[PDB]
Amino acid sequence: AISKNLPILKNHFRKHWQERVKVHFDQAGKKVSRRNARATRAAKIAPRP
Amino acid sequence: TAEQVAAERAARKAANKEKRAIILERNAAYQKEYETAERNIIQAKRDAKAAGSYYVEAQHKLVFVVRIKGINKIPPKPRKVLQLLRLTRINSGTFVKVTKATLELLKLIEPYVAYGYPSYSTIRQLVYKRGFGKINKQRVPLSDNAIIEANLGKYGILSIDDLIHEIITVGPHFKQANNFLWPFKLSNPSGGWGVPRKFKHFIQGGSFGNREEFINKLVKSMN
Amino acid sequence: GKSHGYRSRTRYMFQRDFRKHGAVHLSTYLKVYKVGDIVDIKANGSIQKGMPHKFYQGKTGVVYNVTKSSVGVIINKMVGNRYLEKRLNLRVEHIKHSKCRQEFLERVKANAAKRAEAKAQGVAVQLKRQPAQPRESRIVSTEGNVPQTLAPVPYETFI
Amino acid sequence: AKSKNHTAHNQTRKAHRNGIKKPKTYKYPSLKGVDPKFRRNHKHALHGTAKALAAAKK
Amino acid sequence: PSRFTKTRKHRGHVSAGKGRIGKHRKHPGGRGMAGGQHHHRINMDKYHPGYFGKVGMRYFHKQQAHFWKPVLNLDKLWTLIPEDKRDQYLKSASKETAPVIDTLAAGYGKILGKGRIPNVPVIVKARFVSKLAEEKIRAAGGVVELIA
Amino acid sequence: VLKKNPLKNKQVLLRLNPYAKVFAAEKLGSKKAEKTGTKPAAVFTETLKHD
Amino acid sequence: GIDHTSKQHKRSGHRTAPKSDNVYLKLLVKLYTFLARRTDAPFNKVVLKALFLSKINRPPVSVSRIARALKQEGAANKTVVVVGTVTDDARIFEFPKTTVAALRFTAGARAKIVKAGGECITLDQLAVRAPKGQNTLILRGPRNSREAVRHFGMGPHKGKAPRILSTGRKFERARGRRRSKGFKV
RNA sequence: GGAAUACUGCCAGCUGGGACUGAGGACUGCGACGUAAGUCAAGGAUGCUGGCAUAAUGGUUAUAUGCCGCCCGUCUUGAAACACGGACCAAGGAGUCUAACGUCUAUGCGAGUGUUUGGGUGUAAAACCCAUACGCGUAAUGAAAGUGAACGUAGGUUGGGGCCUCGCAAGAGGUGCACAAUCGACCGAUCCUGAUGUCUUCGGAUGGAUUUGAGUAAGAGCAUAGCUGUUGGGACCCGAAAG
RNA sequence: AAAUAUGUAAGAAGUCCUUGUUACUUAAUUGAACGUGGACAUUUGAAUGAAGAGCUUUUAGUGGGCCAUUUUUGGUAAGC
RNA sequence: GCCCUGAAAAUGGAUGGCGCUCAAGCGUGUUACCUAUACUCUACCGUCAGGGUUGAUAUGAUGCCCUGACGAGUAGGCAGG
Ligand SMILES: NC[C@@H]1O[C@H](O[C@H]2[C@@H](O)[C@H](O[C@@H]3[C@@H](O)[C@H](N)C[C@H](N)[C@H]3O[C@H]3O[C@H](CO)[C@@H](O)[C@H](O)[C@H]3N)O[C@@H]2CO)[C@H](N)[C@@H](O)[C@@H]1O
Ligand SMILES: NC[C@@H]1O[C@H](O[C@H]2[C@@H](O)[C@H](O[C@@H]3[C@@H](O)[C@H](N)C[C@H](N)[C@H]3O[C@H]3O[C@H](CO)[C@@H](O)[C@H](O)[C@H]3N)O[C@@H]2CO)[C@H](N)[C@@H](O)[C@@H]1O
Ligand SMILES: NC[C@@H]1O[C@H](O[C@H]2[C@@H](O)[C@H](O[C@@H]3[C@@H](O)[C@H](N)C[C@H](N)[C@H]3O[C@H]3O[C@H](CO)[C@@H](O)[C@H](O)[C@H]3N)O[C@@H]2CO)[C@H](N)[C@@H](O)[C@@H]1O
Ligand SMILES: NC[C@@H]1O[C@H](O[C@H]2[C@@H](O)[C@H](O[C@@H]3[C@@H](O)[C@H](N)C[C@H](N)[C@H]3O[C@H]3O[C@H](CO)[C@@H](O)[C@H](O)[C@H]3N)O[C@@H]2CO)[C@H](N)[C@@H](O)[C@@H]1O
Ligand SMILES: NC[C@@H]1O[C@H](O[C@H]2[C@@H](O)[C@H](O[C@@H]3[C@@H](O)[C@H](N)C[C@H](N)[C@H]3O[C@H]3O[C@H](CO)[C@@H](O)[C@H](O)[C@H]3N)O[C@@H]2CO)[C@H](N)[C@@H](O)[C@@H]1O
Ligand SMILES: NC[C@@H]1O[C@H](O[C@H]2[C@@H](O)[C@H](O[C@@H]3[C@@H](O)[C@H](N)C[C@H](N)[C@H]3O[C@H]3O[C@H](CO)[C@@H](O)[C@H](O)[C@H]3N)O[C@@H]2CO)[C@H](N)[C@@H](O)[C@@H]1O
Ligand SMILES: [Mg+2]
Ligand SMILES: [Mg+2]
Ligand SMILES: [Mg+2]
Ligand SMILES: [Mg+2]
Ligand SMILES: [Mg+2]
Ligand SMILES: [Mg+2]
Ligand SMILES: [Mg+2]
Ligand SMILES: [Mg+2]
Ligand SMILES: [Mg+2]
Ligand SMILES: [Mg+2]
Ligand SMILES: [Mg+2]
Ligand SMILES: [Mg+2]
Ligand SMILES: [Mg+2]
Ligand SMILES: [Mg+2]
Ligand SMILES: [Mg+2]
Ligand SMILES: [Mg+2]
Ligand SMILES: [Mg+2]
Ligand SMILES: [Mg+2]
Ligand SMILES: [Mg+2]
Ligand SMILES: [Mg+2]
Ligand SMILES: [Mg+2]
Ligand SMILES: [Mg+2]
Ligand SMILES: [Mg+2]
Ligand SMILES: [Mg+2]
Ligand SMILES: [Mg+2]
Ligand SMILES: [Mg+2]
Ligand SMILES: [Mg+2]
Ligand SMILES: [Mg+2]
Ligand SMILES: [Mg+2]
Ligand SMILES: [Mg+2]
Ligand SMILES: [Mg+2]
Ligand SMILES: [Mg+2]
Ligand SMILES: [Mg+2]
Ligand SMILES: [Mg+2]
C-alpha cells in the first residue's frame, strides 16, 4: 500500500524475473579464459600486433 | 608543610568554636522569644476577661498537612494540587504558610489529607528525627548544622533550630527554608487513627480535614 | 442530518440585550487601536460584516494589524494538544478595549512613584503584591454589646 | 453490525502526556497579514534610516 | 547479519512484533500504489503533491546531449589553471601575456556570474556565457571568445 | 553511614543545638511562671454561665 | 506507592563517549575528559562534548569559513579550533596565516594552510600549547546545510522538498502543485 | 473564701521489660566529659564465656501437616469455562534472500567521490595494480524557447556557546561560528514600466510588484557497511470456492 | 439569573524622555510604525511547585472497547 | 421505631457456614485488638541521576570509589545477555 514519507519507487519485478537472472560468477574465469584466448592468438599470429 | 596544614586546622578549629558560640547565643535568645510570646497571649486573654471583653487570637499563620490517601483514583485538580504541595506519597507531610492563596490549595485538597496547626515540639521533633534537605536533588539528612548553613546560610539560618525558628515563626525566608526541607516521610499512626473510617471529615467521622490543634497528637504518633 | 453551519447555536449568544438594540453608539467608532493593543472579542448582531466566529466570543488577544474599518487580532486557540495561532480580521463594533492590562500600567506607574519614596527616604520597598493574610489578634468589646444567646427553632408548617 | 459512534473519553488524557504546549513566542514577530502599503512604505522607512547610520558612524 | 536482527529477539514471543489484534496479514490496503486516489488520498497529497495528472508539453524522440551545457562559474574559473602556474599568472596581471582558459575543452561550455574574481585578467574561451558573467570578466580586464 | 536521632543519643543532641546543655541544667521545660491574681469581669461570668 | 511527577529511569539524551571505535579518537577524549574535569576552562568541556558528535553533527569547516572568522575584529591572531575535519575551498584567493587545530585536514586544506605559512595543530598539540584553551576561536560547520534536512517536516504549505527519485516535469508538479490541476500545495 | 482533683498539653525529666538489626573495615569529620594526662555511647559491635567433628549446622530429596493454588495456548469488552486447538514422545517445523529506497550510525576521501564493465598481474575465482569513460554531487528555474545567484567586511535588528578586556568577586564591555525569530539583497518564473538604438519590429535598458520556486547568500557530498522502516517479489508459515 | 467549567494580564521583549528615517498618513514636525541617544533596582514587581529548559529525526502497536459515581437522550423496562 | 399481616413456583440449600434471642439481631456511644505486595527503619539486586579519581605504585578508565532517588505491565519498542 502507501505509507509514511518516502519517494515513490518503480520496481519492475512482477514478471517472473527470478527466471531470467544472470549472476556473473565467471567474471574470474571469463577473464582468465579471455586472456588465454588472446595470448595464444598472438602466438599463432606471430610478430603481427 | 607540617606547620601550614596545622595553621588551617588550628584556626578552623577556632573558627568553629566561635561559630558554635553564635548558635548558643541565638537558641537561648529563641528560648526567651517563645517563652515571652506565649506568656503574652496567655495573659492578654485574662486581662480582656477582667475587662469584660474577649481576646480573639490571631488566626494561625502556619499549618502542617499530611496526606492520608493513597495514590490511586484521585481527580486531576486535587491530584495536581497534592503534587504542588509536594505530597506525592501516602503518610507524607509538609509545612504550609497559611494565606488565601494556599488556603484555597487546601480545602480543595481536603478529601485526601488531614492537617492542622503544629506545636513547637511537633515541629522540633519532626525536624530533629525526620529532618532532611534538598541539595542537587539528593535527599540529605540534617546531621549537622554545617549542612544547613552551607545551604540556608545565605538567609541567616545556620542552626537546625534556626530552621525550626524560621518555620514556626514563618517570617521572611519561610519559602526557601521550608522548600529546603524534604517532605517528611512518616509511618502510620502508632496506636491507630482513632476512627473506624479515615475518609469521613474530622468533624464527622475523623481524619481527612483540618483538625486544628489535634494535628499534633496525630503527627506525633506518626513520628 | 446534522447541522454545523457558521452561526449555529448562536441564538441567545449573538442576541442584543433586553432594551438595547438598533444603531451602535459612537464610542465604539471613536476608539483608537494601534498594534499591541489587548482587546476583548464580543460579537455584535446588528453588524453582520466583519464579525468573529462564535468561538472567539469571550476570548482576548493582541491586535496585530490596523486597517480601514477593522483590526487584525491574533488569538491563541488549542487544537489537539498545542495552541496554534489564529488571526481574525474583525470590525470595531465587535472589539472592546480590554481592562485586563489597563490596571497593570496603573500598578507599574504607582510602583515607580513609590520607588522615589525609598530614594528620597531609604525605607524598604515592599513592591510585589502579597495575598490576603490570616488577620491578627484583636479584642472585642462587651461594652454596649453583650452576646445575645440563641437556640434552634422548633418545627412548624407555614402553609 | 452496529458499533460505537463517537466519544471524547481518554482524549484529555492522551493530550496531557506530551501535551498542551504553549504559543512559543519570540520578539520581532512575523508581519504576515499586515497592510501592504504599510509594509511597502515600512520597507523604505527602514531603507532610509539605514543610510542615516551609514553616515553617522563614518 | 542475522544474529543482529530483531527477529532473533522475538523467538519465543507469540506473533513476532506484529500484534495480536491486527496480526500481519497479506495485503491490507492493496498491493503497491493502489488506491492513491481513494484510501491513500491523504498520503498522496502531503508528501507527493502534483503526483496525479499531466502538466506541460511532451517531447518525442528526445535525446539529451542536444542540451549538454555543463555549468561553470567565476566562483571557480581559476581552478581550470593548474595550481603552480595559477600563482605566477595572478602575479603577472598582464594585458600582454595573459592566461588562456578554454572552458569547453575543460568539461564545460556555459560560464555563469556567481561570485567575485581577482582583478587579474583572463582570456575566456567558451560558448554560451551569461550577461553578468562577462561584465564581471570585464572588471578583470578580460574577454570572452565564443566557439563550438 | 548511619543517621542517629537527637531525640535519643545525647551526643547528637549536643552536636546540634549546644543550648541543650543549659536547658537541661536549668530545668526550663519544667519552668514555673509568675502567679497572677486576675479575676474575670462579672459580666463575663454572666454570659459564660448564662443560658 | 508514589505519584510520579516525572518519568522514572529516564536517561538524558546526551552521549558519553563517542560511538566511534577509533583508538586515537578514544585517546583525545581520555585527554580532554581529564582536562575539562581538572580545569576551570569551559573550553575543555565544550571540546569534550564535541568529541562525541556524529559525522552529521561535525560538518566540514571550510578554510574560507576559517578565513572570514579571522577577519573578525580582535580575533585576528587567535588559533582557531575545529573539532572535526577541515576542507579546502578554491573560491578564495588571499588566505591569512594563523594556525588551525583540528581533527583532520583535507590534503588541499593542510597544504594550502601552510602556503600562507601556518600550522595544522592536532588537538593534543593544541591542548599542550593552550591547556585552558585561551585565545582560541572555535568554529562550527553548518549542520542544516545537509541534504536530508531539506525534506524534514514535509507538509502541505510547508514549502519543503519531497523525497523524490527522478525529477523533471511529469514528476509531482501537476495535481496539488498548481491552481490549474486540482489545488496548489 | 483557700485548696485539692480531673481533663488537655509541654519537659533538650529519671528509670524497668521485650523484639529485629551489627551494613562498614587504618587514619582524616562534628562533637561532648575533662584542671590536666586523657576518657567517651561522638562519621555503623565489641568484650567475655561455652558448645561441634560417630559431627553440630547448612543443601537437596521423599513423605507428612497448616494455609494457599481452576488448563494451557487463542480470540475477546469479558475464558477455568457448557468457546476453539491439544491422547502421548522424538525428529522436523514459520519475518528470508533480492532489486530500488527513507532516517540514523561507523568509516574512507572531501568540492569532490566510486579500483573490481574492462585491462594489468598472480603463490590464480583471492590478493596487488590502472587508463578512458560513466554515475552522482559542485545551479537553479520555467510547461517551453530561455534566462541563470555579492548594493553592503555575502547585509540590518534580537538572541547565542566559546574566546577576549577590566574586575577577588558580583558584574561589565568586546568578538560573536552552529543555531532561532525577523527586516532586506540576489537567480529563475508571473504581471507591470518599455530608455539609448533598429533595417518598423526588432532589441529589453531602467524601475516597480499582498505573485511564485523543491533556489543564492566563503560549498557537502560521493562511496562501502549495520539495525530499523518502504515497495516489487512465493515474501513470516499453512489454507480457498474458482480460472 | 447562579454554582462548576472558561479567554486575558501580573514586566528588563518593562515603564518612560529625546528626535533620525519613509514613497505610508495629517491642516501641519500632525501621526503611524521602525530607529538614535538617555532615566529608574533591592520584594524585578502574586502563591505554589519544578524530579532541569528548549529542539529534531525516525519508527512499533492501536484505530471491535467495556465498567463505576455524576450530568444525560430514546425506551414501561433491561445484565438494553 | 422494631416486629406482624400484606408476601404464590417448580432437584435439596444456604445472613459464606455452624449456630445465635438482656444476641453472636437492630440504632447509638467508647475503648482494646487482628493483618496487605501500602506507610516508617535497615540489609541486598538492578535502573537512572549527580560527584570524586591512573598525580600513582601492576593485576581492568568500557574501570575503581562516594551519593540520592526510583522498580506494576498486554500489544509494542530498545538494551544487556
Ligand atoms: N539502492 C540500491 C543499492 O542498494 C544497496 O543496498 C545494500 C544495503 O542497503 C542492503 O542492506 C539490507 C538493508 O537494506 C535491509 N533493510 C536489511 C538487510 N539486513 C540488509 O541486508 C544486508 O544484511 C543481510 C543479512 O546478513 C545480508 O544477507 C545482505 O547481503 C546485506 N546487504 O544490502 C544491500 C547490498 O546487498 C546499497 N544501499 C547501494 O549499493 C545501493 O543503494
Ligand atoms: N563573574 C565571573 C564570570 O566568569 C565567567 O567565566 C567563568 C565562570 O564564571 C563560568 O562558569 C560557568 C559557565 O561556564 C557556565 N556557562 C554558566 C555557569 N553558571 C558558570 O558557573 C558560575 O555559576 C555557577 C552557578 O551559580 C557557580 O557554581 C560557579 O562557581 C560560577 N563560576 O565559566 C568560566 C569558567 O569556566 C565569564 N568570564 C564572565 O561571565 C564573568 O567574568
Ligand atoms: N546530472 C545528470 C542529469 O540530471 C538531469 O536532471 C537534473 C536536471 O537536468 C533536471 O531538470 C529538468 C531537466 O531534466 C529538463 N530537461 C528540463 C526541466 N525544466 C528541468 O527541471 C527543472 O525545473 C523543474 C521544474 O520545471 C524542477 O522540478 C527541476 O528540479 C529542475 N531541474 O533535474 C535534475 C536536477 O535537479 C537528468 N534527470 C539526467 O538524465 C541527467 O543525466
Ligand atoms: N533578566 C535580565 C536578562 O539580562 C540578559 O542580558 C544578558 C546578555 O544579553 C548580556 O550579554 C552581553 C551581550 O549582550 C553582548 N553582545 C556580549 C557580552 N559579552 C555579553 O555579556 C555577558 O556575557 C559575557 C560572555 O559570557 C560575560 O562575560 C558577561 O559577564 C555578561 N554580561 O549579558 C547579560 C547576562 O549577564 C538579557 N537581556 C535577558 O535574558 C534578560 O533581560
Ligand atoms: N515623521 C517624521 C518623524 O517625526 C517625528 O516626530 C513626529 C512625532 O513622532 C513627534 O512626536 C513626539 C514623538 O516622536 C515622541 N516619541 C513622543 C512625544 N511626546 C511626541 O511629541 C508630540 O507631542 C507633543 C505633546 O505631547 C507635541 O508638543 C509635539 O508637537 C508632538 N509632535 O512629533 C512629530 C509629529 O507628531 C520625529 N521628529 C522623528 O521620529 C521623525 O522625524
Ligand atoms: N437469614 C434470612 C434473612 O432473610 C432474608 O431473606 C428473606 C427474603 O428473601 C424472604 O422474604 C420473602 C419475600 O421476598 C416473598 N414475598 C416470599 C416470602 N413469603 C417472603 O418471606 C418473608 O415472609 C414474611 C414476610 O412476607 C417474613 O416474616 C419472613 O421473615 C420472610 N422470610 O424470606 C427470606 C427469609 O426471611 C435473607 N436471606 C437474609 O439476609 C436475612 O438474614
Ligand atoms: Mg486558618
Ligand atoms: Mg510546601
Ligand atoms: Mg488566609
Ligand atoms: Mg499495638
Ligand atoms: Mg478501621
Ligand atoms: Mg469496630
Ligand atoms: Mg510513639
Ligand atoms: Mg512512632
Ligand atoms: Mg440539529
Ligand atoms: Mg447576551
Ligand atoms: Mg446578560
Ligand atoms: Mg454582506
Ligand atoms: Mg458494520
Ligand atoms: Mg451492545
Ligand atoms: Mg468503531
Ligand atoms: Mg453514525
Ligand atoms: Mg514522547
Ligand atoms: Mg543475539
Ligand atoms: Mg524472545
Ligand atoms: Mg514461551
Ligand atoms: Mg508477542
Ligand atoms: Mg504459543
Ligand atoms: Mg513490529
Ligand atoms: Mg496471531
Ligand atoms: Mg494491522
Ligand atoms: Mg502520473
Ligand atoms: Mg544508609
Ligand atoms: Mg516502590
Ligand atoms: Mg544560515
Ligand atoms: Mg537557512
Ligand atoms: Mg509560500
Ligand atoms: Mg533527485
Ligand atoms: Mg481544471
Ligand atoms: Mg480547477
Ligand SMILES: [Mg+2]
Ligand atoms: Mg472564708
Ligand SMILES: [Mg+2]
Ligand atoms: Mg478569691
Ligand SMILES: [Mg+2]
Ligand atoms: Mg497529665
Ligand SMILES: [Mg+2]
Ligand atoms: Mg541527668
Ligand SMILES: [Mg+2]
Ligand atoms: Mg561489619
Ligand SMILES: [Mg+2]
Ligand atoms: Mg575531636
Ligand SMILES: [Mg+2]
Ligand atoms: Mg571540658
Ligand SMILES: [Mg+2]
Ligand atoms: Mg577543652
Ligand SMILES: [Mg+2]
Ligand atoms: Mg582533647
Ligand SMILES: [Mg+2]
Ligand atoms: Mg571463643
Ligand SMILES: [Mg+2]
Ligand atoms: Mg530436610
Ligand SMILES: [Mg+2]
Ligand atoms: Mg484452595
Ligand SMILES: [Mg+2]
Ligand atoms: Mg483461537
Ligand SMILES: [Mg+2]
Ligand atoms: Mg470466539
Ligand SMILES: [Mg+2]
Ligand atoms: Mg465476542
Ligand SMILES: [Mg+2]
Ligand atoms: Mg484486547
